[PDB]
From a paper:
The spike (S) glycoprotein of the coronavirus is a class I viral fusion protein located on the outer envelope of the virion that plays a critical role in viral infection by recognizing host cell receptors and mediating fusion of the viral and cellular membranes. The coronavirus [name] is synthesized as a precursor protein consisting of ~1,300 amino acids that is then cleaved into an amino (N)-terminal S1 subunit (~700 amino acids) and a carboxyl (C)-terminal S2 subunit (~600 amino acids). Among these, CTD1 is the receptor-binding domain, and one CTD1 in the trimer adopts an “up” conformation as a prerequisite for the binding of [name]-[name] to the cellular receptor [name] ([name]).
The S-[name] complex was then prepared using trypsin-cleaved and low-pH-treated [name] and [name]. The [name]-bound states showed that the [name]-[name] [name] binds one [name] receptor utilizing only the “up” CTD1. The “up” CTD1 and the bound [name] are flexible, as shown by a 3D classification analysis that yielded three major [name]-bound conformational states, in which the “up” CTD1s had different “up” angles (the angle between the long axes of the “up” CTD1 and the horizontal plane) of 51.2°, 73.3° and 111.6°. The CTD2s of the unbound-up and [name]-bound conformations exhibited a hinge motion away from the spike axis compared to CTD2 in the unbound-down conformation. However, we did not observe more than one [name] or more than one “up” CTD1 in one spike.
Author numbering:
A (entry chain B): 916 to 1119
B (entry chain A): 723 to 811, 832 to 1059
C (entry chain B): 531 to 660, 674 to 722
D (entry chain B): 290 to 385
The structure:
Amino acid sequence: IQESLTTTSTALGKLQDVVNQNAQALNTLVKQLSSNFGAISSVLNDILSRLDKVEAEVQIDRLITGRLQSLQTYVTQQLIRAAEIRASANLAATKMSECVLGQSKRVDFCGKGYHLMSFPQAAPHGVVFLHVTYVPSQERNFTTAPAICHEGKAYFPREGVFVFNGTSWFITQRNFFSPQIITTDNTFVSGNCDVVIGIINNTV
Amino acid sequence: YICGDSTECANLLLQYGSFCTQLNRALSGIAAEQDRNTREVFAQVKQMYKTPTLKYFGGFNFSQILPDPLKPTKRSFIEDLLFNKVTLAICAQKFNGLTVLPPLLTDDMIAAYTAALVSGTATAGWTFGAGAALQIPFAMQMAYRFNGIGVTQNVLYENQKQIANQFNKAISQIQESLTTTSTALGKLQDVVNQNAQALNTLVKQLSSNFGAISSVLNDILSRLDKVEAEVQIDRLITGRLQSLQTYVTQQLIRAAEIRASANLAATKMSECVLGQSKRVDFCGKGYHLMSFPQAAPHGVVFLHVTYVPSQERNFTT
Amino acid sequence: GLTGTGVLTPSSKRFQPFQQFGRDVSDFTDSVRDPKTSEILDISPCSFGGVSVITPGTNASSEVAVLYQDVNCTDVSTAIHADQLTPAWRIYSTGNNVFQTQAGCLIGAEHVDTSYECDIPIGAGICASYIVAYTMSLGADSSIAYSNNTIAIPTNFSISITTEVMPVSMAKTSVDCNM
Amino acid sequence: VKSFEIDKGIYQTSNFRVVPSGDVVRFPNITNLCPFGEVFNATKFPSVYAWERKKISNCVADYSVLYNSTFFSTFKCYGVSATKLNDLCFSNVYAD
């Protein structure tokens, strides 16, 4: 993190995107002050120093009309950016409830993983998280047992799949390689031996 | 679009400031948003996969879901029906001024990403995405997915073949209920119809007058000389400017609705596909065993392997 | 009576003798009859389109490529070599013309079959590097095979804190009407 | 984009267009002086209720004596200019 945020670059870009949207909106607004709208000048009084009457007020009507429409366009795009920024803000409130105050059990929305914790940090105009996610990566080769057939009767494991049929030895999780001794206490009686596609005896 | 061309019009256009710059910036931003849309929806598995061509798993027919090597092309048959379903209403060479840009993502590779997602869904284990893949034979998948409803494999393996059957027929009935059917593939057509009518109405605005003599440039240009000229041309430019600004603002509002649905789109290709989304009547009207992506013109179409629990008893507690 | 600017070609109609014009979609002429016995279509888009610079970012390079949009990449050569482009440069001549994926001309980039993982979005699948212009490797293509019997568990793992940028408040602006 | 140091990427800029090459003007081979030297310089100048109407065709219009000689009290044009009128071929001028 003290790498990824500190010497680094535009992988924090969206907040500058927000500010650049503000700046281009506002600079566009100022440049519309610097623009004509079919009247003589781009700035008043300048004309009114050399304007007389009805000619004058027609040109000032032109300027006021154009200033008004440009301003209103600014208003509308601000409101649209406000709507988008607040849908994302509802997402921010969401992950600060969901992903912060607990572990948001929904999958691959908090970050890119299984989301062990989360740490917010403030920001200009925004918020930047630190998603304490999870990434499991090692790999293997192991063989199958969708059930357990000890005495001629089946044992579906605990459903939560892959019984450790690595040499038909134990029971296992979804994510971590884990030795689990079979007893009666660890699986459940489910009928006779019907479709035990991986058969394991001596399950006592 | 505006101002189509003469000489005088560009001068009278740059009278009105950076309006050309404003509109072109805003539509560039909308273009980049649609790029982001299709990236964030589809390109969510980085490390792609193979169409595995086992294609038969006890009885688990993925018929036509995946594009197949026996096909001439590489777009799957369901999606081919989808393409044929959806109408319109070298390059574009038309002096409206307009264009439909070509999309970013290659259309067959749109399909290839769908194939990747469906195939690694059909394989690879639950952990898929946050990792790569973990070697699970797909009946162990639904044996695992019975925990996102809270039941046993005594559902699955004690009823094995039957389950696949209720799979296959319904998918085949999908082939019925997408060939034979009607408006229940609506919203894509709705999107294209909105954009069709909006853009064609913009075209008709170029046919439209705004209180001027003509309603087309180069017409007045033979019988305009001076101040009369620029008055009529200012009327034309003013109206075309207002109409085009209206168009741009509505495109922006549409794109906002599209991106809220795109948030949903990523959410249902992540939550519904890559794991099982435990929330209720979010993915589908069941308890949501699986779901599969499918491509489409300008949009995505899911396939929700729901779960309708249906028989009835009476007991004492 | 008709002025304007465009690319002619002969007519392709069932053109009625009393008619003269074509106005095809909305008052857009597109087809006419010559006043000295010939019959011609008038596709007035000579060409147009936006251009766009493709640059590595003035911190390791200074060499551009110039994407043209609405062309089929032989019109551009005639526009260059009779000096017909409106952004008429001087220090500029054609390196090559990679063109398909119909987004238009691309001046100053090479085909590469060994397509990379797409820095920059040039139009329709095609992307750049360094400056080359390949189509796209869609990712890293991992072929995979998954039999029934064969399974693996992760045996070690990681933690991976990453960023995420959630905007909330824009600049709380305000505007005087009076000033 | 107003910077010396600019980051990497496709950036929008102006809109190019191929400048046209030459000139194509296409008229008929209709070649005739107008009767304007007599349809204006006429004899029978009628009443108002019995205003006269001629259709005149197959001609080539001049528009040149009308300006370099100020015989005329009121010149006025309505849907049209005055001087750039000698651009276009017309259908059936009407002397009223």
